[PDB]
Each structure stands twice: as structure tokens, then as C-alpha cells.
């Protein structure tokens, strides 16, 4: 273990509680001490990882199982079709364009010819006439994006260059004269950019100098008449809704804004699904934690009427207007999708298609499209694009494209959903994937995955590496739908955030206890994983019950819950986490904050034989979202408290960081994490 300096004079007073921050100096990523820290950790990691002799066999199996063609869900503009393509091992997917669903495709933009395919396409937008394609190119490693515009007819670029963009989409007016987008100043703004002009000429539509932390999404109605600005605070599921009637502008957008402020508060989420003239249909969580559809006339905006009411059980996840006058409602019922077809006008049920364990998503049909396309993936289904022609065969889901994994028989394996009790009684859904007919004799290595926050729903999607775990390591995989997610609506999210964040860790721990008890595995043969907020998850559980885990892998997680809010965009995470500038909130945080809760378990009575599991902390050296200081400080603390502070520590399990989104880069991370896992669980290859 490399020596790491401790600044013993850094202490802070949080409402009378003293907290030392020995590793405060690691909060600066450009000091040479800090770079040296990285290099020394990298030397240790690599040293350890050579010992992990299955890394090379994982790498090739992942590579072999990923090497298959993948057509993405096609979308239509005018009479052209557009979709993403990857022949199997390309670094980034490729945007392609076609005249007909099964005619010759044409490459439209290929990110692999730029910076080695370091980054792929994040913003992409085709105009209504299909003649223009506005896409987002990254400059360096940084969050920032430049918007350029290609002509689809001949793939020539417009001179137009829009800087200072991040997550904004390009939303085209139906006149094909330009698009709305949402940049930051050289305080996000809503702007309109006329094709063929300089960014300096772009029309300002909205800014709020008084509320700089508010950020924006926007949309344009399927008829082209209304531009909708959404305004959000933090990561709450809640937003404003302003509307601008573009037909009532006397000189188009060149005039200039006078928004009809339909919803001017953050009480509820609102998404627009459809409109007939001024009569709008929204999806909302207003008085309906599991969501519902409502209808309101903008010319009488006070009167809201339910159109499809809130289900007593199921989350209404999204909704789409299709085929002139229908709705497809995507429900999540016990973390399983259910698609309903309904009449747009009456909200009456017409058809109800349950879906197998797995996930459907990417429904991009628009109101005038009569053919709907969506993608289905599962643990043992690599990816199916289904098509439903609502006109001519509304009932049958026909297969449009079908990915096949080479040399993999899915009939060897199975997937079940079972429900397990948590500390406070609550039932927790979990997904267990493994080989058919196995004995529940406690012998199998086991990998458990979870997230636990921000209303994110964890779906059992396809991972190739996971097949390799199942087949070539005789493994059992568990995806755990703990609270803090949005799987059971807003009450599910609220029962695992702020003052109740602890429940999330308790839910995960219980899922592990279930798998130990039912004979799937045993303590010390369990591996946990999770990224970002699920790195926080992993870190917290191994502090509280290190006895349960053989291995642990936290990817760019949030570890200093006292100071997370001070860095890059961490301030938008205070809705979920609390903020340590408030006593009540400080007190939630201090109890579970990873870097402040590393204690030697062998010093606890009746617990002398317990050590932290083998831990890999995966992180970049320069991450713009979850600043790596988090991971470094945790690494620093663990290594200190459990290894370097003692002469001959019981902590034999290694504590390392792996230090680095392109395909082969991604396979390397995953093959490493899996080999490390194999060595930690003492598990042989099959």
C-alpha cells in the first residue's frame, strides 16, 4: 500500500460535531501530490489485477457475446426513416438513414471517424422535412457540446456552429426554418436559432437571472402550433409548464416572451402527450404518485379533468399518442412492463398486452405515424425491435429486427421474480437469474446489483458480461429493486430518500440475507455492484454489514455526503440527499456517509473474524459529474483505517481503485471488475 499523506489540521464544526477531513487535499485534481496518488493507486491496482488470472478469459467471452449486429428503433420524419446501427464491436453506434424500412441504409454521421470514437452521439435531431440533421459533437473530454447541422440529401455541413450546449435537444419548428435549443451563457436559456445565421443572432425566449439553478427542457406539439418550455429544479420529479402559441405571433419568432404560464410551480410533474387545438392531454403525478393522464383546455386553464385515472397498483411510466387518435400507455406492474392501447378521446381501454420479464422502451412514434416501433431487452433476450401496425393489425406484435448472441443457448438459464421482506416489513421485488436446475446448497458465487434513488427504475436488461458470469462462473445474478427508485411510484421514491435513505441500504442488505438463507449462496461469496448513487449504496452496505460480502465494486460513487453539494452539479442532488448546511439534514447524512463511517469490524465484540470484502473502487481521474475526490477520499480512508494504520492487519482482502462511452474501453472495465470478482470469491472458470 502506497503512503498517502494525512492533513491532521483539517477539522470542521457541523452544529457542535467535529469532523476531521484528513484527505481534504485530494479535492484538487491538478496538484501533483494528487496525480501521484492516482499513479500510486494505479501501480497497486495493476499489481493486484495481474494476479487475477481470469481477466483474460472474461475479456474474450464478453467480446464474443457482444459481437452481433444491433439495429436501433427506427423513427420517421416525412418519408425517411432514421435509426442507430452498430455491426457489433464498433466504438460508438452509427446514425443511419433509409428511404424505406428494408431498403439500402446510408451512413449519415459516423462518430468512430472522430477522436477514435471516444464519444458517441448524445444530441441528435432530424427536421420535419427530413432534410436537416442537427447533432452534438464533444470538444474534448468535457461536458460541453458543439451543435452542427448536416444536410441529409448530400451530407454537407451548414456553416452554423452553436457553442455552449450540454443536454439541450434541438426542437424543430414545422416550417423547417430553425429550432429551439437551450444553451448556457459564454443560467441556462431557451433560444431559437434560424438556419443559416450566426449564434449571436439567436432569439432569446427565456432566462431567469434570479433562479440560476433552474434548468430547462422543451418540446413542440405534434401539430407545430405550440412551443412548450418546461422548467425544473434539481432532480425532483416536478416541473413548470409554459406554452407559447406560435400561430399567434404576428411576425413569427422574428418578433422578440409572452408565455401562457399553465403551471407556475414545482408541486407536480407534467409531460404533454397530445393536443387537439388548445385542448391538452398531460401525464402528471399531481395527487397521483403512480401517475395518470389529465386533460385541460388552455383557454380555461383552471379546470383539470382525469382522462385515464391513477391505478391503485401500477406506475404509468410513459404515454404516447399514436395513429391519429390512440394512446399507448407503458405501465410498470411489479417491475414488469404492460402496454395498453386506448382511445385518445375517451381514455377507454381497447387492448392490454403484458410483457415478459425484461423491458420495453424507446417508443418514438408520433401522432401521425400508424406503425409503432419499440425495443425489448432482457437478461436472456439481447434485443428485439417489435412493430405494431395499428391500422392493419393492431393486435399482433411482429418481430422487426432480432439480435442474436452467438453460441449461447438461453434455454440453459432462467429468470424468476421473487419478493423478499426488508427490516421494516416492506416487500422488495428482486430478479434472480441463474442456470436451470441448480441446487440451493449455498455454494454458488453471487452478484447483486442495485441503485436506490432519484426515481430511477432498475430494469432487468441485457448484459453480455452477465451471461459470462452465469455460464462461465456458475454464477447467480440478482437485480434488486430497492426503495428510492420509482418502481412503485413517488411513495417508493420518498421512502428511500432524505431522512429515509437508510431504508435503501436495509432493503439491499435484506436481499442479500434472502439469498444466503434460501440456499442460493452464502456470506462472503456475495458480490455487490452499483454506479453513481449505487456506488454510495455499495459503500454504505459494506460499512454496515461487511460480514455479508465477499466482494464489492463501487463505480464513480458519492462518498462524502457532507460536501458532495459543493462540487460541479452535486447541488442538484440535495432533493434526494439533504444538505449538510442544515442540522436536521446533517444528522441523516453523518450516519451513513461512506468516508465518515469506516470502522474496523474485527474490533466489535463477537465479530473478530470479519473483514471488509475485497473492494474495487472504479473511477475516472477527471469526472465532471461525480467528482472523483469522492472515490479517492474513500479509498484513502479505507486503506488507512483498515490497512496502513496497523502493523499486521486482519484486512487481507485487497482495497484498490481501478482508474480510467466507447465499447472496448467498456469491455475492459467490465472484464477487470469480473476477474477481480472471480479471484475475491475464490471461484473457478467453467
Amino acid at each position: 500500500y502506497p503512503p498517502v499523506r494525512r492533513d491532521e489540521t483539517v477539522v470542521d464544526d457541523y452544529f457542535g460535531v467535529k469532523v476531521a477531513d484528513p484527505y481534504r487535499w485530494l479535492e484538487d485534481p491538478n496538484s501533483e501530490e494528487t496525480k501521484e496518488f492516482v499513479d500510486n493507486q494505479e501501480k497497486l491496482a495493476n499489481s493486484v489485477l495481474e494476479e487475477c488470472e481470469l481477466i483474460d478469459k472474461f475479456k474474450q467471452k464478453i467480446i464474443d457475446f457482444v459481437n452481433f449486429p444491433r439495429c436501433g428503433v427506427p423513427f420517421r420524419r416525412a418519408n425517411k426513416y432514421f435509426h442507430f446501427y452498430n455491426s457489433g464491436l464498433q466504438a460508438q453506434n452509427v446514425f443511419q438513414m433509409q428511404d424505406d424500412l428494408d431498403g439500402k441504409p446510408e451512413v449519415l454521421y459516423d462518430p468512430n471517424l472522430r477522436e477514435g470514437g471516444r464519444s458517441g452521439l448524445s444530441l441528435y435531431s432530424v427536421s420535419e422535412d427530413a432534410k436537416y440533421f442537427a447533432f452534438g459533437i464533444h470538444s474534448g473530454l468535457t461536458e460541453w457540446v458543439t451543435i452542427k447541422i448536416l444536410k441529409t440529401e448530400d451530407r454537407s455541413y451548414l456553416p452554423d456552429t452553436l457553442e455552449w450546449v450540454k443536454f439541450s435537444p434541438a426542437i424543430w419548428t414545422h416550417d423547417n426554418k430553425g429550432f429551439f435549443y437551450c444553451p448556457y451563457p459564454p443560467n441556462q436559456e431557451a433560444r431559437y436559432h434560424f438556419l443559416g445565421t450566426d449564434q449571436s443572432e439567436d432569439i432569446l425566449l427565456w432566462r431567469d437571472l434570479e433562479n440560476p439553478a433552474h434548468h430547462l427542457k422543451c418540446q413542440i406539439t405534434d401539430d407545430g402550433k405550440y412551443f412548450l418550455l418546461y422548467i425544473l429544479d434539481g432532480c425532483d420529479d416536478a416541473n413548470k409548464v409554459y406554452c407559447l402559441d406560435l400561430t399567434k405571433l404576428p411576425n413569427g419568432l422574428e418578433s422578440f416572451a409572452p408565455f401562457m404560464k399553465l403551471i407556475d410551480s414545482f408541486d407536480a410533474s407534467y409531460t404533454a402527450i397530445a393536443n387537439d387545438g388548445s385542448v391538452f392531454t398531460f401525464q402528471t403525478n399531481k395527487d397521483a404518485p403512480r401517475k395518470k393522464l389529465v386533460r385541460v383546455d388552455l383557454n380555461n386553464p383552471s379546470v383539470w379533468t382525469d382522462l385515464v385515472p391513477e391505478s391503485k397498483k401500477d406506475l404509468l411510466e410513459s404515454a404516447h399518442a399514436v395513429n391519429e387518435n390512440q394512446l399507448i400507455l407503458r405501465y410498470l406492474s411489479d417491475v414488469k412492463h404492460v402496454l395498453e392501447i386506448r382511445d385518445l378521446e375517451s381514455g377507454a381501454l381497447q387492448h392490454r398486452l403484458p410483457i415478459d420479464i425484461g423491458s420495453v422502451d424507446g417508443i418514438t412514434a408520433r401522432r401521425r405515424d400508424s406503425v409503432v416501433f419499440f425495443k425489448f431487452t432482457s437478461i436472456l433476450t439481447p434485443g428485439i425491435v417489435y412493430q405494431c401496425d395499428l391500422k392493419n393489425d393492431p393486435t399482433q406484435l411482429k418481430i422487426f429486427r432480432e439480435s442474436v448472441v452467438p453460441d449461447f443457448d438461453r434455454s440453459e438459464f432462467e429468470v424468476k421474480q421473487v419478493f423478499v421482506p426488508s427490516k421494516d416489513g416492506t416487500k422488495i421485488p428482486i430478479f434472480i437469474a441463474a442456470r436451470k436446475g441448480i441446487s440451493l446448497d449455498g455454494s454458488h458465487p453471487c452478484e447483486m446489483h442495485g441503485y436506490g434513488g432519484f426515481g430511477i427504475n432498475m430494469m432487468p436488461t441485457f448484459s453480455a458480461s452477465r451471461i459470462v458470469f452465469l455460464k462461465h462462473l456458475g454464477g447467480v445474478f440478482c437485480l434488486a429493486n430497492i426503495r428510492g427508485g420509482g418502481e412503485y411510484g413517488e411513495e417508493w421514491h420518498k421512502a428511500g430518500f432524505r431522512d429515509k435513505k437508510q431504508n435503501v441500504f436495509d432493503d439491499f442488505i435484506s436481499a442479500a440475507e434472502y439469498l444466503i438463507s434460501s440456499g442460493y449462496t452464502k456470506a462472503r461469496r456475495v458480490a455487490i455492484e452499483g454506479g453513481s448513487n449505487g456506488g454510495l449504496l455499495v459503500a454504505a452496505c459494506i460499512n454496515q454489514r461487511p460480514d455479508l460480502f465477499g466482494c464489492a465494486e463501487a463505480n464513480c460513487g458519492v462518498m462524502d455526503m457532507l460536501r458532495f453539494h459543493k462540487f460541479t452539479l452535486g447541488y442538484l442532488w440535495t432533493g434526494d440527499y439533504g444538505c449538510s448546511d442544515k442540522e436536521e439534514e446533517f444528522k441523516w447524512l453523518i450516519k451513513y456517509s461512506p468516508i465518515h463511517n469506516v470502522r474496523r469490524p474485527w474490533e466489535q465484540p463477537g465479530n473478530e473474524e470479519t473483514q471488509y470484502p475485497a473492494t474495487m473502487i472504479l473511477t475516472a481521474d477527471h469526472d465532471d459529474r461525480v467528482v472523483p475526490l469522492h472515490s479517492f477520499k474513500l479509498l484513502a480512508t479505507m486503506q488507512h483505517v483498515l490497512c496502513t494504520s496497523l502493523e499486521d492487519s486482519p484486512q487481507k482482502n485487497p482495497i484498490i481503485a481501478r482508474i480510467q462511452r466507447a465499447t472496448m474501453t467498456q469491455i475492459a472495465e467490465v472484464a477487470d471488475r469480473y476477474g477481480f470478482m472471480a479471484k475475491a470469491l475464490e471461484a473457478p472458470w467453467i
Binding site: 442507430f84 453506434n93 462511452r661
Partner: peptide, 6 residues
């Protein structure tokens, strides 16, 4: 737009 289901 993930590049591969790894």
C-alpha cells in the same frame, strides 16, 4: 445510445 450491451 449505449454502444454495446456489455
Amino acid at each position: 445510445n449505449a454502444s454495446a450491451p456489455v
